[PDB]
Amino acid sequence: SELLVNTKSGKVMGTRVPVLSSHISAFLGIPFAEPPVGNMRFRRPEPKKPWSGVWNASTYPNNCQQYVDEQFPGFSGSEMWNPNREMSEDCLYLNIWVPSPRPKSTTVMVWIYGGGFYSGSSTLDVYNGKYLAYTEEVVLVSLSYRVGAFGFLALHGSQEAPGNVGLLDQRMALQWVHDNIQFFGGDPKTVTIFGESAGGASVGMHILSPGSRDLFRRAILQSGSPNCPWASVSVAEGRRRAVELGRNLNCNLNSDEELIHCLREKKPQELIDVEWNVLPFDSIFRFSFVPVIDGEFFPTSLESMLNSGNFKKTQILLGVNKDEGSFFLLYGAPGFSKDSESKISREDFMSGVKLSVPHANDLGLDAVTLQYTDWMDDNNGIKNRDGLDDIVGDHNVICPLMHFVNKYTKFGNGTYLYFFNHRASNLVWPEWMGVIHGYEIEFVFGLPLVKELNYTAEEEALSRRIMHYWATFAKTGNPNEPHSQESKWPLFTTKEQKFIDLNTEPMKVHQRLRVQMCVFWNQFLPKLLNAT
Amino acid sequence: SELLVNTKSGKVMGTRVPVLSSHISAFLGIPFAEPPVGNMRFRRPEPKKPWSGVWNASTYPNNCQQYVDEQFPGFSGSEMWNPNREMSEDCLYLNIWVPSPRPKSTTVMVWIYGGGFYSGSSTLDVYNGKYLAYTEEVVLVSLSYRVGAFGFLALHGSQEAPGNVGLLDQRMALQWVHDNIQFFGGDPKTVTIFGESAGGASVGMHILSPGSRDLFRRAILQSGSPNCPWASVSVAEGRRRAVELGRNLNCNLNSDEELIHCLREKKPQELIDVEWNVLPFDSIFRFSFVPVIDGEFFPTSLESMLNSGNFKKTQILLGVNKDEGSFFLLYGAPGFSKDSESKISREDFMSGVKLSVPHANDLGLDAVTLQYTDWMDDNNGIKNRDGLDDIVGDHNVICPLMHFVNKYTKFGNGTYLYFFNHRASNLVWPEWMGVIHGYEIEFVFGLPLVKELNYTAEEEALSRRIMHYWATFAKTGNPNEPHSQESKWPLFTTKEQKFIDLNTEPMKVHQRLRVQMCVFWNQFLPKLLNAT
Ligand SMILES: COc1cc(CNC(=O)Cc2ccc(CNc3c4c(nc5cc(Cl)ccc35)C[C@H]3CC(C)=C[C@@H]4C3)cc2)ccc1O
């Protein structure tokens, strides 16, 4: 009865799940779209046709077809991110965690996983929503969307492979929530979408896209924003990459109709196996198939829409991690290792910045190098290692997000900015990697509340402060409970630009997060590249 | 007898001078050239034709025709630099202080005054050589040369105004020393030339010029070097400024000879009054009539000569002051005042950068601005003032000199590098201007040994260290006395790049003098301006 819910698409049967020392309801693997299989590959998704009977929704759905990281087999630090379920092109499902007993009209949060737009799963351990739903009395939804070529191949002009269909996948899940969340105790007029990395940029892209704005109330962006350099491409580049994807598979390249037909004949892993051969340069933090600026989902360039205020006016809560770049240097840069301190030589450093700013000309490379090199101590392996990390994280995450937050605040209705700089007491990665890309998700999702996971007492407390900020923001548009005796997270304004740290210590308020480096990244370096 | 000396050109009668609690010999205003007057204006100097009888040499000579600074009339701090004798085109004289009794063969130091190549006199109080001749038992010479258009108007191709005749004035005095200093007790085989500002660049230019290399032994350069941006021009820009000086005074511009004839009819102050009107930009630390890269004095470009090693190989001692730029901001930049602390607004800062890097495009100015702005505190008037100060000093003196120091040390036979950062306890200029362009000369010349000048006991000891450094270096090529247990001024090498502070505290050895900012000024900015 509590577990049996009738939706506009059909009946669904959930399952009772234990959560700490209590229980809540879970609805797992609910379909929201028609499977994008066969001739529906590279397609705009179509709504799930209603079903008769009762949908068994007690088990996680499949994961979408994606690259699988096999660098450290058996290593929990890397495999906690890989698909923990069978992969399939039939993957467009969503999951819901409802408090027990079921609320009447409670706040809804909708998780959007990240992963460079080429990977990601709704079913990972760190995305399990029971702790959040149960602790903050919210209805927690995690959606899914097609990644890699399956969701972002873009042959603009074709209605058959138009691009951005993975973004339409998320839009349609949010439409489902809009149409059905009431039957689970959720209030569709108070829906918060939130995501990390490509999920965070996705969230920002729904803030921008007119066809998405009315499908949610407010937004949380973690280590990602729509203007990121890795987050979108022109139709010309997206076309070039799709045409090049065919050339790698001996496809006929004369018509989109022929190219699309050829690529529809390929097994999923055939596309995945050559997915990276299509990038223009040797690079890190760069991905082949990503959203496109198409004049449709995005009416104009991301920057003109930001200048004109052409976007959803609401409240946003967003932030970054202290060492966003370390994960990428480990995997793609010379001199970095999981098992050493990864002191970086001068020769390696130069190769690093080349691989980090792959679009820059020789003058631009000098500019980056000069801004991050202490020429009293240029052979210092550690300053060179830490410099390269800052290069990667500033260029790709921090400074793109800061440009977004300053532009948005000029028109929005409330900004809250955080800096997550706590290193987990139980990290499995070496100490040089710092506060890693994606390792705040464990605290947002309350995993430190599980005593067997061996977080410290202070980390359980930090994870509860964070969950409550997120939830209170989702409920009210403000992370702070007014009238409460707690330290207050201040609003980010255009003039004072305040933000807080997130960590185990009492709160500190700072101003102008990485202003110096981000003036370089957001104003000087593009002006130098435009000229030259 | 001690004061009567026979030279290859005629007899000279000196005078017996008091110094501290003793006396020495002084020969003032000895002619070394024919008066470059009338039809000889702008021409190469001619050797002074011998005279019969006894030249009265007990009186300072005339000063050369030059701009006279009247900003602060009566103020000792600016008027100590103005001509203290009558001005005249008949100004090619030299002065000699000789210890008493006369030594047999003793080291010779030849002083070359600075002043932007448009001003400067051999006869100023701070250049009075008795203290240095007496305290260090050297024969001390101060020469003179033509400045302004009189010394450096350049119409390459013409033999009537070929350019660089001011440098040639210096060369001829050096030739006279080589020919006569032995009669005053000086060893012509151990002559050290030294000068500040334009005088330091001049010393450097004699190191480069083949026709000068044999006329001296070793060199000291203070707050100036031949590759400074204000220190030379092309033949085209010299001709351009010459033609414009003509246009400014309604001269026939048809031919070099008509133009030269017209200018030779003008009174001296007629030329001076329009001297500034020929500069290409609104600028500070830029001077109209300066040496020319002509192909004869300088065989090729200064950089090629520095690269090929085409220069005199010997020992050099050289350095800079802490705040070279404040004097020029006082006189030519908005917001600076003699009587206030001159906190600089952001608008005046921007106006400063433009006047300071007049040859930069907009990308260059943003580069300078970014490099010297603290964007956590951009409305700090002190930080803005001190930034503008560093921009002027680094771009015009410190970084130009460090490039010379590095290039020269690769081929030279001994470099010694100093950083003079003591601020005199009796300065008449405000604290914000720091250690000023020019104000190390007083310590080099031992003015702190005069009790009436109200220096501190520790400044007299500093001045004595400096005099002994200079004289010892001149005597031996090493500022350090052997087998003394005083701290040793380390040789500057290609790889360790050590230098010393000069102040009242015990000496410390540092490395890489302002290497961060000078990578920008010597390697990045020129590359950016060449690319844009
Ligand atoms: C656009 O900017 C402007 C720039 C100027 C330039 N100002 C001048 O030429 C005036 C001037 C000022 C001073 C001198 C000679 N005096 C000095 C000299 C030196 N340092 C000084 C430091 C101070 Cl604080 C004051 C005077 C010094 C150090 C030596 C180098 C020079 C160039 C001149 C001598 C000797 C000559 C000429 C005038 C008006 C402007 O608007």
Q: What is the 3-state secondary structure (H, E, C) of B260-307?
A: HHHHHHCCHHHHHHCHHHHCCCCCCCCCCCCCECCCCCCCCCHHHHHH
Rounded to whole angstroms, the Cα distance separating A374 from A327 reads 23
Residues whose CB falls within 8 Å of the CB of residue A419, separated by 6 or more in sequence, listed in order: A319, A320, A322, A499, A500, A501, A502, A510, A513
Q: How far, in Å, from the CA of B328 to the mean position of ligand 1?
A: 7
Strand partners, A436: A323
Which of B353, B362, B366, B499 has the highest number of chain A CBs within 10 A, making it the mutation to test binding with A?
B366
- CA closest to B496 among chain A residues: A376
CA B402 to chain A, closest CA, distance in angstroms equals 14
- Nearest-CA neighbor of B177 among B165, B155, B164, B192? B192
Which of A361, A362, A375, A527 has the highest number of chain B CBs within 10 A, making it the mutation to test binding with B?
A375
Number of H helices, E strands in chain B: 18, 14
Partner residue facing B370 (CB), from A376, A512, A519: A519
- Nearest-CA neighbor of B272 among B66, B18, B41? B66
Answer yes or no: do A363 and B531 touch at CB < 8 A.
yes
Cα A500 to Cα A497, B238, B328: the distances in Å are 10, 59, 43
Strand partners, B512: none
Domain boundaries, chain A: 1-532
Angle at A19 (CA atoms; ends A16, A24), nearest 5 degrees = 35
B16: amino acid identity, one letter: R
Q: Are B62 and B85 in contact (CB under 8 A)?
A: yes
Atom of ligand 1 nearest to the CA of B441: 28
Q: What secondary structure does DSSP assign to B440-491, as a single string?
A: THHHHTTGGG-GGG---HHHHHHHHHHHHHHHHHHHHS-SSPTT--SPP-PP
Answer yes or no: do A512 and B376 touch at CB < 8 A.
yes
Pairing mode of beta strands B509-511, B498-502: antiparallel
A118: amino acid identity, one letter: Y
Name the residue at shortest CA distance from atom 36 of ligand 1. B69
Rounded to whole angstroms, the Cα distance separating B248 from B418 reads 43
- Nearest-CA neighbor of A400 among A479, A323, A319, A326? A319
- Nearest-CA neighbor of A134 among A22, A59, A220, A28? A22
- Residue matched to tokens 């060179």: A384
Rounded to whole angstroms, the Cα distance separating A14 from A30 reads 9
Which two three-digit tokens encode residue A232? 């979108």
Partner residue facing A528 (CB), from B363, B375, B511: B363
Rounded to whole angstroms, the Cα distance separating A381 from B332 reads 45
Experimental method: X-ray
Q: What secondary structure does DSSP assign to A411-438, as a single string?
A: TSS-EEEEEE-PPPTT--S-GGG-SBTT
CA atoms within 13 A on the CB side of A235: 15
Answer yes or no: do B370 and A524 touch at CB < 8 A.
yes
- Dihedral (CA of A377, A379, A382, A388) sign: positive
- Residue matched to tokens 């004949």: A265
Name the residue at shortest CA distance from atom 16 of ligand 1. B81
Which of A520, A524, A525, A529 has the highest number of chain B CBs within 10 A, making it the mutation to test binding with B?
A524
Cα B166 to Cα B45, B141, B150, B500: the distances in Å are 9, 17, 8, 33
- CA closest to B371 among chain A residues: A371
Give chain B positions within 8 Å (CB) of A374. 516
Rounded to an integer, what is the distance from CA B296 to the centroid of its chain?
22
- Nearest-CA neighbor of B314 among B478, B130, B498, B482? B478
Rounded to an integer, what is the distance from CA B439 to the centroid of its chain?
12
Atom of ligand 1 nearest to the CA of B116: 32
Rounded to whole angstroms, the Cα distance separating B316 from A459 reads 63
Atom of ligand 1 nearest to the CA of B330: 24
Rounded to whole angstroms, the Cα distance separating A65 from B473 reads 77
Q: Decide: residue B264, CB within 10 A, 0-12 exposed, 13-18 middle, 19+ buried.
A: middle
Which two three-digit tokens encode residue B112? 């070359």
Residues whose CB falls within 8 Å of the CB of residue A507, separated by 6 or more in sequence, listed in order: A487, A489, A500, A501
Atom of ligand 1 nearest to the CA of B67: 37
Partner residue facing A515 (CB), from B376, B527, B531: B376
Q: Which three-class secondary structure state does DSSP give residue B509?
A: strand
CA atoms within 13 A on the CB side of B527: 15
- DSSP secondary-structure letter at B199? H
Element (H, E) at A302: helix A302-308
Q: Are A272 and A65 in contact (CB under 8 A)?
A: yes
Q: Are B481 and B474 in contact (CB under 8 A)?
A: no
> Is any atom of ligand 1 closer than 6 Å to the C-beta of B78?
yes
Angle at B486 (CA atoms; ends B481, B488), nearest 5 degrees = 70
Angle between helical axes of A362-372 and A381-393 (0-180°, round to 10):
120
Element (H, E) at B500: strand B498-502
Atom of ligand 1 nearest to the CA of B196: 29
| Best of B196, B437, B441 for a ligand 1 pocket test (most atoms within 8 Å of beta carbon) | B437
Rounded to whole angstroms, the Cα distance separating A472 from A317 reads 11
- Residue matched to tokens 């577990």: A3
Rounded to whole angstroms, the Cα distance separating A294 from B31 reads 83
Backbone angles phi, psi at A112, to 5 degrees: -125, 110
- Nearest-CA neighbor of B477 among B520, B414, B434? B414
Backbone angles phi, psi at A17, to 5 degrees: -125, 140
Rounded to whole angstroms, the Cα distance separating B371 from B383 reads 13
Q: How far, in Å, from the CA of A518 to the mean position of ligand 1?
A: 39
Name the residue at shortest CA distance from atom 39 of ligand 1. B332
- CA closest to A497 among chain B residues: B376
- Tell me whether residue A178 is one of the annotated catalytic residues: no
- Other Cβ atoms closer than 10 A to A379: 9
User: Based on C-alpha coordinates, what's the Rg of chain B?
Assistant: 22
Strand partners, A218: A192
Give chain B positions within 8 Å (CB) of A532. 531-532
Single out the catalytic residue among A9, A122, A158, A197. Answer: A197
Answer yes or no: do A532 and B527 touch at CB < 8 A.
no
Rounded to whole angstroms, the Cα distance separating A330 from A149 reads 25
Rounded to whole angstroms, the Cα distance separating B393 from B402 reads 12
Rounded to whole angstroms, the Cα distance separating A402 from A410 reads 13
- Other Cβ atoms closer than 10 A to B40: 17
Q: Can you give the length of chain B in residues? A: 532
Rounded to whole angstroms, the Cα distance separating A322 from B185 reads 71
Q: What secondary structure does DSSP assign to A447-475, as a single string?
A: GGG-GGGT--HHHHHHHHHHHHHHHHHHH
Which two three-digit tokens encode residue B285? 């630390």
Single out the catalytic residue among A136, A160, A275, A324. Answer: A324
> Is any atom of ligand 1 closer than 6 Å to the C-beta of B67?
yes
Q: How far, in Å, from the CA of B324 to the mean position of ligand 1?
A: 12
Name the residue at shortest CA distance from atom 15 of ligand 1. B81
Q: What secondary structure does DSSP assign to B329-346, as a single string?
A: HHHHSTT--SSS-----H
Q: Are A173 and A190 in contact (CB under 8 A)?
A: no
Name the residue at shortest CA distance from atom 9 of ligand 1. B69
**Percent of chain A that is helix, strand, coil (3-state, to 5):** 40, 15, 45
Rounded to whole angstroms, the Cα distance separating B173 from A36 reads 92
Which two three-digit tokens encode residue A70? 């096999």
- Nearest-CA neighbor of B500 among B516, B489, B491? B489
Long-range CB contact pairs, B262-270, < 8 A, 24+: B263/B41, B263/B42, B263/B149, B263/B153, B264/B38, B264/B39, B264/B41, B264/B42, B268/B65, B268/B87, B268/B89, B268/B150, B269/B65
> Is any atom of ligand 1 closer than 6 Å to the C-beta of B148?
no
- Nearest-CA neighbor of A5 among A33, A26, A22, A23? A26
CA atoms within 13 A on the CB side of B33: 30
Partner residue facing B516 (CB), from A375, A511, A532: A375
- CA closest to B364 among chain A residues: A528
Backbone angles phi, psi at B323, to 5 degrees: -130, 60
> Is any atom of ligand 1 closer than 6 Å to the C-beta of B197?
yes
The overall longest dimension of chain B from CA atoms, in Å, is: 73
Rounded to whole angstroms, the Cα distance separating B282 from A453 reads 68
Interface of A with B (CB under 8 A): 363, 366-367, 370, 374-376, 511-512, 515-516, 519-520, 523-524, 527-528, 531-532
- Counting one residue from chain A and one from chain B, the pairs whose CB atoms sit within 8 A come to 45
E-strand stretches of A279-354:
292-293, 316-321
Can the peptide bond before residue B101 be classed as cis, meaning omega within 30 degrees of 0?
yes
> Is any atom of ligand 1 closer than 6 Å to the C-beta of B224?
no
- DSSP secondary-structure letter at B217? S
- Nearest-CA neighbor of A347 among A361, A333, A332? A333
Rounded to whole angstroms, the Cα distance separating B96 from B108 reads 10
Give chain B positions within 8 Å (CB) of A369. none
Q: Are B330 and B338 in contact (CB under 8 A)?
A: yes
Q: How far, in Å, from the CA of B81 to the mean position of ligand 1?
A: 9
> Is any atom of ligand 1 closer than 6 Å to the C-beta of B437?
yes
Q: How far, in Å, from the CA of B345 to the mean position of ligand 1?
A: 23
Q: Which three-class secondary structure state does DSSP give residue A318?
A: strand
Q: Are B407 and B419 in contact (CB under 8 A)?
A: no
Rounded to whole angstroms, the Cα distance separating A226 from A232 reads 8
Q: Are A334 and A352 in contact (CB under 8 A)?
A: yes
Q: Are A494 and A409 in contact (CB under 8 A)?
A: yes
Interface of B with A (CB under 8 A): 363, 366-367, 370, 374-376, 511-512, 515-516, 519-520, 523-524, 527-528, 531-532
- DSSP secondary-structure letter at A63? B
> Is any atom of ligand 1 closer than 6 Å to the C-beta of B119?
yes
Rounded to whole angstroms, the Cα distance separating B161 from B150 reads 9
| Resolution of the coordinates, Å | 2.5
- Tell me whether residue A437 is one of the annotated catalytic residues: yes
Name the residue at shortest CA distance from atom 31 of ligand 1. B115
Q: Can you give the length of chain A in residues? A: 532
E-strand stretches of A255-374:
292-293, 316-321
- Other Cβ atoms closer than 10 A to A3: 17
Q: Are A389 and A321 in contact (CB under 8 A)?
A: no
Which two three-digit tokens encode residue A281? 């340069």
Rounded to whole angstroms, the Cα distance separating A412 from A317 reads 11
Angle at B128 (CA atoms; ends B208, B189), nearest 5 degrees = 40
Cα A493 to Cα A405, A407, A410, A412: the distances in Å are 10, 11, 8, 10
Rounded to whole angstroms, the Cα distance separating B279 from B238 reads 10
Q: Which three-class secondary structure state does DSSP give residue A103?
A: coil
Q: Are A96 and A30 in contact (CB under 8 A)?
A: yes
Name the residue at shortest CA distance from atom 3 of ligand 1. B332
Which two three-digit tokens encode residue B237? 């820009």
Cα B285 to Cα A524, B138, B260, B392, B398: the distances in Å are 27, 34, 27, 8, 13
Q: Which three-class secondary structure state does DSSP give residue A402?
A: helix
Partner residue facing A375 (CB), from B366, B515, B531: B515
Which of A361, A362, A363, A525 has the highest number of chain B CBs within 10 A, making it the mutation to test binding with B?
A363
Cα A221 to Cα A28, A201, B119, B234, B525: the distances in Å are 24, 7, 64, 57, 38
Strand partners, A319: A222, A418
